[PDB]
Design a protein around this motif. Structure first.
Motif, short mmCIF file in Angstrom:
data_model
loop_
_atom_site.label_atom_id
_atom_site.label_comp_id
_atom_site.label_asym_id
_atom_site.label_seq_id
_atom_site.Cartn_x
_atom_site.Cartn_y
_atom_site.Cartn_z
N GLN A 74 -22.17 -15.62 3.55
CA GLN A 74 -22.94 -14.62 2.84
C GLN A 74 -24.03 -15.31 2.03
N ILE A 75 -25.18 -14.63 1.90
CA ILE A 75 -26.34 -15.22 1.24
C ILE A 75 -26.02 -15.59 -0.20
N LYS A 76 -25.22 -14.77 -0.88
CA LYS A 76 -24.86 -15.05 -2.27
C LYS A 76 -24.15 -16.39 -2.45
N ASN A 77 -23.54 -16.93 -1.40
CA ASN A 77 -22.79 -18.17 -1.47
C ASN A 77 -23.50 -19.35 -0.82
N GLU A 223 -23.10 -24.39 1.49
CA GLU A 223 -22.52 -23.38 0.61
C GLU A 223 -22.41 -23.90 -0.82
N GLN A 224 -22.41 -22.95 -1.76
CA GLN A 224 -22.21 -23.23 -3.17
C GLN A 224 -20.82 -23.84 -3.39
N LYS A 225 -20.64 -24.45 -4.57
CA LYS A 225 -19.32 -24.98 -4.91
C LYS A 225 -18.34 -23.87 -5.27
#
Length: 229
Positions: A74-77, A223-225
Motif C-alpha cells: 500500500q502507498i501509505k507504507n 517499505e517503511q519501517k
C-alpha cells in the motif's frame, strides 16, 4: 535474440521485459521486436524497434516495457521507489508520434484489478499527449530536477494521472514515491491503494524504423519501517 511475437516476453530475477503489441491491429501495417541486452545486478539494458503506420493514428499500438518484479505494498507504507532510466531514441524522417513513459497501476487489493493508473512521460514526440478530461493540465509540479504538467482523465473505470515532463528527459533519476505522495496529498489518490504494477517503456502511435535503446533501467520498492495495515 529479439522476440517479435505479440505477447512475447523474457523474465529475469527482478524484471520482465514485454513486447506487448496489445493494439497492433489498430495500425494498417508494421511490426515490432524487443530484446534484452544486459542484466547486471538490479540494472537491466534492453531495446525495442518498430514500424507502425496507418490505421488509427490516434491510438497506442504497443507498449514494450521493462516491468519490475516486486512485493506489492500500500502507498501509505512505501518509503521510497528509487528508479533510473537512460535511453536513446532514433527513427526515420517523416511522421513520428510516440512517448517514453513509466506506467504504474494501483488496486484496492494486491491481486485486484486496476483502479488507478499513474504515468510519467519522460518524452512526448510529434504531439503525443496523455488522457485528459479537460484537455488542460490540472497542475505543474517540480520533482527533483524536472518539472511536470499533470493531467487527469478516465480510462473505463480507471482514473489515469499522467505527469508529463516539461522538457524531454533522456537520463532519468527519481524517487517515484514522491509522485505517488503528491497524488495522495493533493489529488485524492487513496493511500490504502496497493501499488501493483511498475513498468517503463515506450508507447508508439506512428513511426518508421524507430528504435529505443534503454542503456540502463532500474527500480525498487522499499517499505517503511513501521507498517500500518
Amino acid at each position: 535474440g529479439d522476440y517479435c511475437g505479440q505477447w512475447d516476453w523474457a523474465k529475469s530475477t527482478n524484471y520482465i521485459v514485454y513486447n506487448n503489441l496489445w493494439n497492433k491491429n489498430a495500425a494498417a501495417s508494421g511490426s515490432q521486436c524487443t530484446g534484452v541486452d544486459k542484466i547486471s545486478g538490479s540494472t537491466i539494458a534492453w531495446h525495442t524497434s518498430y514500424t507502425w503506420t496507418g490505421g488509427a493514428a490516434t491510438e497506442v499500438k504497443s507498449y514494450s516495457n521493462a516491468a519490475l518484479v516486486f512485493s506489492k505494498k500500500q502507498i501509505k507504507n512505501i518509503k521510497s521507489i528509487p528508479t533510473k532510466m537512460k535511453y536513446s531514441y532514433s527513427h526515420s524522417s517523416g511522421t513520428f508520434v510516440a512517448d517514453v513513459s513509466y506506467d504504474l497501476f494501483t488496486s484496492s487489493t494486491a491481486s485486484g484489478s486496476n483502479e488507478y493508473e499513474i504515468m510519467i512521460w519522460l518524452a512526448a514526440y510529434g504531439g503525443a499527449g496523455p488522457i485528459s478530461s479537460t484537455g488542460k493540465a490540472i497542475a505543474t509540479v517540480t520533482i527533483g530536477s524536472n518539472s511536470f504538467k499533470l493531467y487527469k482523465g478516465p480510462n473505463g473505470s480507471t482514473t489515469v494521472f499522467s505527469f508529463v515532463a516539461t522538457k524531454t528527459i533522456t537520463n532519468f533519476s527519481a524517487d517515484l514515491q514522491k509522485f505517488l505522495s503528491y497524488l495522495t496529498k493533493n489529488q485524492g489518490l487513496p493511500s490504502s491503494q496497493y501499488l501493483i504494477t511498475l513498468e517503463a517503456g515506450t508507447e508508439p502511435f506512428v513511426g518508421t524504423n524507430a528504435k529505443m535503446t534503454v542503456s540502463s533501467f532500474s527500480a525498487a520498492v522499499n517499505e517503511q519501517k513501521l507498517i500500518s495495515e
